[PDB]
Ligand binder design. Structure first.
Ligand code: HEM
Ligand code: HEM
Lengths: 137, 137
């Protein structure tokens, strides 16, 4: 289920985090504009950058804590507030998160590993609603 | 589902509030001690007492407000704090609330009417968690 999925991802986190984030950037290549130096590179070239695995791992470390502090796939408002107030996310709107979760759910459905993909879709929807409640445009 | 149940109960709030509150007292008769004016009264005598219909409808109106503001049956912590800080609830513990929700779910499963009874049991569990976080014993 969703709670065990968090342990699945945590057990091989840099591999899942890069694979999911690459699925997001390949599904929505225009989203590369929020990052620096990601355009113009294939997946293997991104994975050998200095910063790419380390930053994607940090993103998923935090995503999994948000998911673990949730009840029934509903994140805490304080975790939504932190994501809205991070200076690194000052340019974003909730649509950027919904695209990330659409790609994440598609990855889980396609994978050989069992995941509770419907609960990740619901968690993404609930996080978008919480980000909007916390004031993201 | 749970959102429709809020509308079903709302639509005839006096009748459902009285029926569920009496199901509570009749399953857990020791709970009637907290309502000193209802001691020794039949159900029709209760229904002749203005405060009984008025105050039970108010209880259920507030429950429905808390249920409608929940996300995926997870209530707001602010709503749990209201219920804990009410002077009328000074002497209670989370087990009183657990009893009410066991009776409410039993009533739903026995009724003709369709209800998403599993969701009301999970809402009751999540609400007792939030009452305890908000300082109920
Ligand atoms: C629940 C979803 C997300 C979480 C948990 C999250 C978390 C974080 C974290 C922890 C960092 C710090 C990375 C570091 O400095 O090492 C970061 C940076 C950043 N985030 Fe997010 N983020 C999320 C979603 C998004 C989305 C959807 C976008 C844009 C489409 C985005 C754009 C950015 C950018 C531009 C940075 C700084 C640039 C960089 O790391 O290269 N984030 N994020
Ligand atoms: C989610 C569940 C509950 C809600 C929403 C709730 C709500 C309320 C409200 C709105 C009132 C004020 C009624 C008025 O003055 O008109 C009230 C009074 C009161 N509540 Fe609750 N209550 C809940 C659970 C409980 C439980 C489980 C108990 C005890 C076993 C309890 C014991 C009482 C008592 C003793 C009063 C004062 C009686 C009166 O003056 O009518 N409540 N409640």
């Amino acid at each position: 289920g969703f709670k065990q999925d968090i342990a699945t991802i945590r057990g091989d986190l840099r591999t899942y985090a890069q694979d999911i984030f690459l699925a997001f950037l390949n599904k929505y290549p225009d989203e590369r504009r929020y990052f620096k130096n990601y355009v113009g590179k294939s997946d293997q070239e991104l994975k050998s950058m200095a910063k790419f695995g380390d930053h994607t791992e940090k993103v998923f470390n935090l995503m999994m804590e948000v998911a673990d502090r949730a009840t029934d796939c509903v994140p805490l408002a304080s975790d939504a507030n932190t994501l809205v107030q991070m200076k690194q996310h000052s340019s974003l709107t909730t649509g950027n998160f919904e695209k990330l979760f659409v790609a994440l759910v598609e990855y889980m459905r396609a994978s050989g590993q069992s995941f509770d993909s419907q609960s990740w879709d619901r968690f993404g929807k609930n996080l978008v609603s919480a980000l909007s409640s916390a004031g993201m445009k």
